[PDB]
Structure 1
């Protein structure tokens, strides 16, 4: 490409489709486009797993006491009722109030 070309072809817009097949420069630009995806895939996993571990380590002792109060290992009270409505989260569904609006 010629210097100072901002046109669609020079900067990587791909006109062809996978069925017809790419041109060479569109193929190289395409490889550049995929490399970022592979790199994101490889890099994100470590940070996600480490954040997961930190969350689990910080929360690990939180539980529902027989008072339904949510207390950590030290009996300090995080919440008086679980989820503030005191209900488990699996059995709920979405609803419409219909008195509102």
Structure 2
């Protein structure tokens, strides 16, 4: 991306469906979001269990 690109593509809007398939940038941004979910799931457990 160009510098200072606040457009939807650049900042992680996946304009495709799962049937259409994600583009490589959409794939990476989606992996980032899913990683957030995985970290939350793996980090909340200790602190909720305590």
Query: What range is the shorter-chain TM-score in?
Result: over 0.9
Using structure 2 for the length normalisation, give the TM-score.
0.94
* Residue of structure 1 in register with 2:40 after alignment: 40
Determine which structure has the larger strand proportion and give its number.
Answer: 1
* Residue of structure 1 in register with 2:30 after alignment: 30
Which has the bigger relative contact order, CA under 8 A and spacing at least 6?
A: 2
Aligned length: 48
In structure 2, how many angstroms separate the alpha carbons of the residues matched to 1:41 and 1:3? 33
- For the pair shown, which has the larger CA radius of gyration, 1 or 2? 1
Determine which structure has the larger helix proportion and give its number.
Answer: 2
Structure 2: unaligned runs, 5 residues or longer? none
- Per-residue deviation, 1:32: 0.3
Q: Give CA deviations for 1:27-84 in whole Å, capped at 9, x if unaligned.
A: 0000000000000000000001xxxxxxxxxxxxxxxxxxxxxxxxxxxxxxxxxxxx
In structure 1, how many angstroms separate the alpha carbons of the residues matched to 2:33 and 2:26? 10
In structure 1, how many angstroms separate the alpha carbons of the residues matched to 2:8 and 2:43? 30
Give me the CA root mean square deviation: 0.4
Structure 1: unaligned runs, 5 residues or longer? 49-101
Give 3-state SS (helix, strand or coil) of 1:37's partner: helix
